[model samples]
Each structure stands twice: as C-alpha cells, then as structure tokens.
Target: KLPAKRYRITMKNLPEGCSWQDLKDLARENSLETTFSSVNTRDFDGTGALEFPSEEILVEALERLNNIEFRGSVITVERDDNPPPIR
Candidate 1:
C-alpha cells in the first residue's frame, strides 16, 4: 500500500541566494518537523522534500512558506492495503 498521504511541494520563483538550508530553517521556525531529502540545486533555484509529521503540520508549513513568497504545490495520495512497488 502507498502512504496514507504523499505531498510534493515545489517552491517556485525563489530569490537569489536562497538555499535548502534556509527553507529547512523556516519550516522549523513555524513549528514543523521536516525531513529534507534528494536536494537538487541549480543556479538560483533549489528543491527538496519537507516531510511533516501530520497533515495539519503540512498545511501550516505551506502557509508559512507562502508568506515568504515561496510558491508551492501539495499533493496527497491514498492507496489500498497492498503497498505499491518500490522504485
């Protein structure tokens, strides 16, 4: 089975010098626990995962990030008892 929820957040239109560490710090400031993985950086852009403990925390994190002009998108997925095959 897949996770009860799977969220993907993409921060677009980032400013210069913005780093993954910066985003991680911001999430912590807003009382959200996050696990950053597969960080990819190019030029002035950065991308990484922010795994929250719960959906509420996820929503709160998104709002806080948005306040800083970080555009993002979230996706939640549901699956049956049979887990999806690992990549």
Candidate 2:
C-alpha cells in the first residue's frame, strides 16, 4: 500500500478583477507551479487545482497566493503518499 499522508488546497478572497490567468501567473511567480489541464469559468468564478512535488512547495505556493491583495484560504487534505493528485 502507498504511504499515508494528507493534502488539501483552498483559494479564497480573490480580487474582484482577478482572472484565472492572474492566479496562475501569481502561483508561478511565487513558487507553487501548476499546469491547468482544464478550466471552468461558469457557475463559480473558476475551479482549478495546482500540483507540487512536495508539501513544502504546496505551502509556499499557498503563501504566495494568500499574500495577494485578495485574501484567500487553503484546505489541507490527507491521503496516501504516492504522488500529487491534481485534477
């Protein structure tokens, strides 16, 4: 079985004029690098996920996003340690 672990991600308090691209760019600039396979702009502002090699990188990425003008929160997820599961 895979190693046990937990991971989660949450982004909230976004700027009024913030776009998906802006978030993506900010994450890249900060340290949380991500590759968006698909993006949905309907219903909710936008729904997407970011991937990182390790928890350290994930934390750093969330910190960068939180520092933006728009305040946001991230969730912590727990699961088996294998590889980052982003969809």
Candidate 3:
C-alpha cells in the first residue's frame, strides 16, 4: 500500500544547467549523504532520487519542498514510487 513510500524526492520542471549535486544537497544532512551512490539521478529531470534516512525527513520534504522555486519555474518535488536500484 502507498507503494511503501519508496520516499525519494522527485523534482519536476527543473531548469537547464541543473546539477544532480544540487539535488544531492537540498536538505539538512542532504540526500546525497543518505542515498546510496546509485540512488538514481542525473538531471533536474533525471532522478530527483534522493532518499532521507527517516520518515520524518521524507514527510517534511514532501510538505515544504514540493513546490520549490527555480528560475521562475516551480520545481516540484514528489515521490519516487517506482523506486530504482542503486547504480
């Protein structure tokens, strides 16, 4: 149910020159630290695939960081329901 959350941050409508590292470093104790090396991501449209170590972190991000702003674009964050394997 609810796909077990597979709670990775999914960003949409990202801008050009976007760095996966930016996605990698969005939150306190950023995702890159928690997520495995192959956590899936390459662009704004790549894999917003950053997973927090706890449910609290995932919930907070889902609520506050969903509609983030970037260069006049609403870079939305969502769930990575179809979770992928670490590369």
Candidate 4:
C-alpha cells in the first residue's frame, strides 16, 4: 500500500547509514509539483517529509519506488501525520 498523503511524502524503515541526502535529493527531484520541504519529524533518520514538492509526489514516488531494497532493507513510503505548515 502507498500513501497519497496530504502535501507530504514519508519514507520509512530507512536502515542505518543510508544517505538521507541521497533520498532527499532524489525525492526533491522526483516530486516536481512543490519544493521539497525540510523534514518536521525525526522519528526515524530517513523518517521525514517531502513536498518533492504534493499529494502526487508521495503517490508517484511510491509507485516508482516502494518496498525498497536499498541497502538491503525493505522500506515503505507513506503520508506522515505532519503538523501544519509554519507561518
């Protein structure tokens, strides 16, 4: 299952040492609707947000790359219950 989250992308189960910036950069490029916003939560290292930049980003990203085998971990991407945008 993939998350068509509200205005965000949540990358999950990021095993240790996987480059966040790599995913960040990849996500930023993949999601083209809005700018990739800085992650609001750090529950997990790769646990974060992306605008990449909309609802479509996470949806599209998951479609393209879900159940990831990166660094040998099966990862998941979903919509985070992220807080409202900053003023």
Count of residue pairs whose backbone atoms collide, per candidate: 2, 8, 1, 1
Q: List the residue pairs that clash in candidate 2.
A: 5-79, 6-77, 6-78, 6-79, 7-77, 7-78, 8-77, 12-72
* lDDT by residue (tens digit), candidate 3, 1-87: 566655466656665454555555556544324452223334345334457777777778667777877678776767767657899
List candidate 3 stretches off by more than 4 Å. 29-33, 36-47, 83-87
Clashes of 3: 1
CA lDDT, every model vs. true structure: 0.52, 0.50, 0.58, 0.59
Query: Where is the poorest 10-residue window by lDDT in model 2?
Result: 71-80
The runs of at least 3 residues in candidate 4 whose Cα sits more than 4 Å from the true structure, single-residue gaps closed, are 1-5, 18-20, 28-34, 37-46, 82-87
lDDT of 4 at 79: 61
Off by over 4 Å in 1: 1-4, 37-40, 45-49, 67-87
Best of the candidates, TM-score: 3
lDDT, candidate 3, at 35:
51
lDDT of 4 by residue, 1-87 (tens): 543346665666765444446666666566544455454233455554455544565568767666777677777876666456789
Q: Per-residue lDDT for 1-87 in model 1, tens only?
A: 335444445554454344567656766776877665234465544444456656676666666565354345332212113446798
Q: What digit string (tens of lDDT, one per residue) describes model 2 on residues 7-81?
A: 335444332343557656766777666654123455464344445557676666656554344345432322224
Stronger candidate by lDDT (2 vs 3): 3
TM-score order of candidates, top first: 3, 4, 1, 2
The positional error of residue 40 in candidate 2, measured at the CA in angstroms, is: 4.7
* Model 1: worst 10 consecutive residues (lDDT sum): 73-82
